[PDB]
Write a protein that binds this ligand. Structure first.
Ligand SMILES: Nc1ncnc2c1ncn2[C@@H]1O[C@H](COP(=O)(O)OP(=O)(O)NP(=O)(O)O)[C@@H](O)[C@H]1O
Ligand SMILES: Nc1ncnc2c1ncn2[C@@H]1O[C@H](COP(=O)(O)OP(=O)(O)NP(=O)(O)O)[C@@H](O)[C@H]1O
Ligand SMILES: [Mg+2]
Ligand SMILES: [Mg+2]
Ligand SMILES: [Mg+2]
Ligand SMILES: [Mg+2]
Lengths: 587, 587
């Protein structure tokens, strides 16, 4: 393991959790699989990288590479084995899962084309030192007949999907694989009632679970004997979409922070602009968790919003639903969010956070278990926490430093508070924060914006959590399959489709108005944000399944998929009071 | 309060320490703990993401006409208003003091934190060294008198002079012209020493390996008349320092702009394959440049810069040591060696480079490069590094796997090259990634097989080829039109250049090779042969060196870690300075 075997062109080493391979703070892969080599190769040689993928064969489905130096997105065309499009050096070559590559699939780099052969460089095929100075691992027979190009693999039971090239030229290239509507259908299921949820099924021995009870009782939803399922094909679409939209959202965030006209649309205090930028530039890789809201049904997959600032439901999807399973599911399926705690613990272990982080939650019994759920992650990652319930335990020394109750310094914190809240305190000649007070009255903004404090999630995360970014995403990725047309007005095309009126910095499902392509108000909610800037997002009603509208939620943990959860409501607009609906992935 | 003790915070949480006798924030140099400039610059960066260049004295800030936006190396305009100006001294502006009274010769600077119609509050660092009133975010209050539109401030001191304030804005109304220096101060004068035989035998100490290195190459000699020297006024040096820091920031801005636009970068004739790396380099090794050298024409007419040797520059030993020996040996006046601390500031930039513990020095087998290697070896040694000089490439070879190793078999991972990158680029002009060897029968390692090895960390960084290439001159002209120090440089002989006459110069040449100086009369004032005849030329406005005491003197300033590192001369019987032109003692 790890023995250096040789080098691909340009001098890219080839070898045979704590195996994460990074070059700077860019994730190359897992040591030392086929994907890690192809990614690193592309990263050291062309400054580009493809998004996270579970299996190597999932690569052949991407249609874009990211250019790191400027978070720019480039077009990547795919080509089937046997194409007029010739397989040039440096192109990605992918294998479907099958034979030698049972389930994984495979990927390598074409280092050199010939007249009757081709040389590829790759990892996890060869585990022996290569001959002095030879920069390739295998050769593959190529058949050039009638302008068409075919590659023949050295194995006898492996399908080669094709090669890929980063180019605008779409000629000879195939279309982006589109998933079957049926495979995306959500459908109800039921457990056999043997009184499995008739009592204290939630383990009250566990402090975390018990905190949940204190805030919600022994309840997940009205009927715990009923649950829903999604095909394992859907979860994969969910993983494709989550990872892909995650990059999109950042590509737009960077785009926003690069032009005062675009940033100006978010109504953030103009005094926080330079700080937004600086935060983006040095904490771009420090985001920890996020939740994406989707509509999923036979029509396809659409994104409503990306709660990137401060999300929740982690405890529910990643702990309670597990208990529910362990308590009453005897099937073969699985909870798409089972390993959320670890995913998070992972993200924390690699976050440049201080050894001792203060957890800042509000004095709401409902946040208690959320703060503790996260504290579990931080503790699993080896950090020291101290859960601050409200701003009362906070104070300043004589000089002006932030100390907690025990009297220690507060320089690193993970908040439950949304940044827009601290923003509010500003909207009343440079970030006005107190550094001392006769009564020691410390405020939220007096902590989160104290330059010396390391906050999670980062400041810039409020750009992607703000809806003013949706119209921008549309502008940059027009007619993208997961996107919904949204604008800061009701344009001609929207007036025609119907739309959702939404406050740019709202949440909980507040002040949302749903108008049809007719005139009628399909549904409306109240809220505290009825006075802020609204956006209008193309309508796209939630699917009703077994008497409840259902919205799919995935989580992002450090940029990548972290799980899926369900949310149901008797009405079209999911709200804070909505129920969590058990979900079980099936194949 | 002792040194380093925190007394309080300015607006936004910018701490104020007691400087009762160097600070960085990430990778950005802020100042020296804890001067008035260290706080002034830190305030701006933490609050506004901008910063102003390295200044010798705080009073010099008032002469600066631009700020730097760090998050994108963009340059912002900064106007200066006299104290007594219609322009009101808004909060956040810079308040600069001229040297005098309480602020003797250092001068002084502070930040206006708030206005009160009849008063103003400011924060600073090297004025009061005692804790401040719990919570008070200012250090002093000045009386602002407003009489008929004008604004005047009165400083709490009776003998000091307040220059005015500065505001980053495009509105030049009420503002001051960027001062110019009286050409008479920029004149280079000839001087002579009393001949009492100070330079007749062996004045260079041969027991010092360094000096001996110099002598084995040049003998006990610097120029043809060691008794004659030149002088410039301390004001000209200040100007020279002013210009060096300014141009350095300019070139770096021009580099950023080039690596952000393919249509520009393409004018450099750098093998495409390297583009992604050029970019990656600018991004990581942004602050890793050690030392460069600028070439100027200075005289009553003012200051012009011909080129900026940022890749590989020499003359460091001559200026910072041999001339030191010359003075210590035959000078007894009051003037000084403008380059005396090179070695010390050199060790400086190394100590703060992200350099690896053992650094291989790579020179070419030139009895002349030996002392430039060894001189640099001293700074490395002083900054605490282990070195081994490599003369030529015979000593290099590869392991069985393909790793670069030196004579004594150790790994070559870090390197300070004497070689010019273009030499390595040339080995590319003769694939699907940079064509380097990671193995070879005869174990024959080329230059490029080292500099472009991904694991090999080199100095100077790859990107420096850009500023070092003269295709940047036209770009620089384009960005900073009729700039005080720039010369009209284009890629063709445009109308204007026909009028002035111009220099024909290869974009990637050195030593003064293949230069053609044509007059407005359209005559060839001078020519030089060379090995760069066949590459792309740029044409720069003629601006002949001045002739002083029989020779033409060109001024040179060293850049070191981005800031002025000293000055030296070079004279020649011709208008063209070459590798053979001698160094002339400056004082
Ligand atoms: N374009 C749309 N078409 C149909 N329904 C929509 C649309 N946008 C939103 N909704 C519904 O409105 C709810 C609220 O919209 P959403 O974009 O999630 O805003 P939010 O208040 O920021 N969410 P959250 O932070 O989870 O509480 C969703 O959960 C959907 O059920
Ligand atoms: N615009 C100009 N007008 C008049 N003389 C010039 C001009 N540009 C250059 N020269 C002269 O030509 C010499 C060579 O030009 P320079 O720009 O230093 O090129 P170089 O060969 O890259 N320098 P170097 O790397 O130090 O050896 C200068 O030192 C001057 O003596
Ligand atoms: Mg939502
Ligand atoms: Mg939301
Ligand atoms: Mg020169
Ligand atoms: Mg040069």
């Amino acid at each position: 393991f790890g023995t250096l075997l040789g080098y691909a062109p340009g001098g890219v080493a080839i070898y045979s959790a704590v195996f994460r391979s990074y070059i700077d703070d860019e994730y190359m892969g897992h040591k030392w699989q086929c994907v890690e080599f192809a990614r690193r190769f592309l990263f050291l040689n062309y400054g580009v990288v493809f998004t996270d993928v579970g299996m190597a064969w999932e690569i052949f489905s991407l249609r874009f590479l990211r250019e790191v130096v400027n978070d720019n997105i480039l077009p990547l065309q795919a080509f089937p084995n046997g194409s007029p499009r010739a397989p040039v050096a440096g192109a990605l070559l992918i294998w479907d899962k099958g034979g030698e590559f049972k389930d994984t699939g495979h990927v390598a780099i074409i280092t050199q084309l010939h007249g009757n052969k081709v040389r590829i460089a790759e990892q996890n095929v060869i585990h022996s030192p290569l001959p002095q100075g030879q920069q390739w691992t295998r050769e593959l027979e190529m058949v050039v007949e009638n302008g068409c190009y075919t590659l023949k693999d050295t194995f006898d039971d492996t399908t080669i999907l094709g090669w890929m090239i980063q180019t605008e030229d779409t000629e000879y290239s195939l279309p982006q694989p589109e998933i079957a509507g049926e495979l995306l259908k959500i459908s109800g299921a039921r457990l056999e009632n043997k009184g499995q949820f008739d009592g204290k099924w939630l383990d009250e021995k566990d402090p975390l679970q018990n905190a949940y009870v204190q805030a919600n009782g022994q309840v997940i939803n009205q009927d715990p004997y009923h649950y829903y399922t999604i095909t394992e094909s859907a979860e994969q679409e969910l993983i494709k979409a989550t990872n892909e939209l995650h990059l999109m959202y950042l590509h737009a965030t960077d785009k926003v922070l690069k032009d005062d006209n675009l940033l100006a649309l978010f109504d953030i205090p103009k005094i926080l602009w330079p700080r937004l930028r600086l935060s983006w530039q040095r904490r771009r890789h420090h985001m920890i968790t996020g939740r994406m809201d989707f509509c999923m049904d036979e029509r396809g997959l659409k994104v409503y919003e990306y709660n990137a600032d401060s999300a929740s439901c982690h405890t529910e999807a990643g702990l309670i639903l597990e208990r529910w399973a362990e308590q009453g599911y005897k099937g073969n399926g699985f909870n798409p969010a089972e390993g959320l705690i670890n995913e998070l613990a992972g993200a924390w272990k690699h976050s440049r956070a201080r050894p001792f982080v203060h957890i800042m939650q509000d004095k709401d019994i409902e946040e208690n278990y959320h703060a503790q759920f996260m504290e579990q992650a931080l503790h699993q990652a080896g950090f020291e926490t101290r859960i601050l319930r409200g701003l009362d335990e906070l104070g300043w020394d004589a000089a002006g430093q932030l100390i907690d109750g025990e009297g220690r310094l507060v320089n690193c914190v993970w908040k439950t508070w949304a940044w827009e809240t601290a923003f509010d305190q500003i909207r009343e000649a440079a970030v006005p924060i107190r550094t001392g007070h006769p009564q020691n009255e410390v405020r939220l903004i007096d902590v989160l914006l104290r330059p010396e404090v390391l906050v999670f999630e980062p400041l810039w995360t409020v750009i992607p959590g703000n809806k003013a970014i949706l119209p921008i995403l549309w502008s940059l990725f027009p007619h993208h399959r997961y996107l919904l047309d949204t604008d800061f007005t009701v344009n001609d095309e929207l007036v025609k489709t119907g739309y959702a009126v939404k406050p740019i910095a709202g949440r909980c499902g507040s002040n949302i108005d749903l108008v049809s392509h007719h005139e009628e108000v399909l549904d409306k909610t109240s809220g505290k944000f009825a006075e802020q800037k609204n956006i209008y997002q193309q309508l796209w009603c939630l699917p009703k399944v077994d008497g409840k509208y259902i919205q799919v939620c995935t989580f992002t943990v450090g940029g990548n998929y972290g799980g899926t959860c369900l949310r149901g409501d008797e009405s079209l607009v999911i709200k804070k009071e909505s129920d969590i609906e058990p979900l079980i992935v099936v194949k």
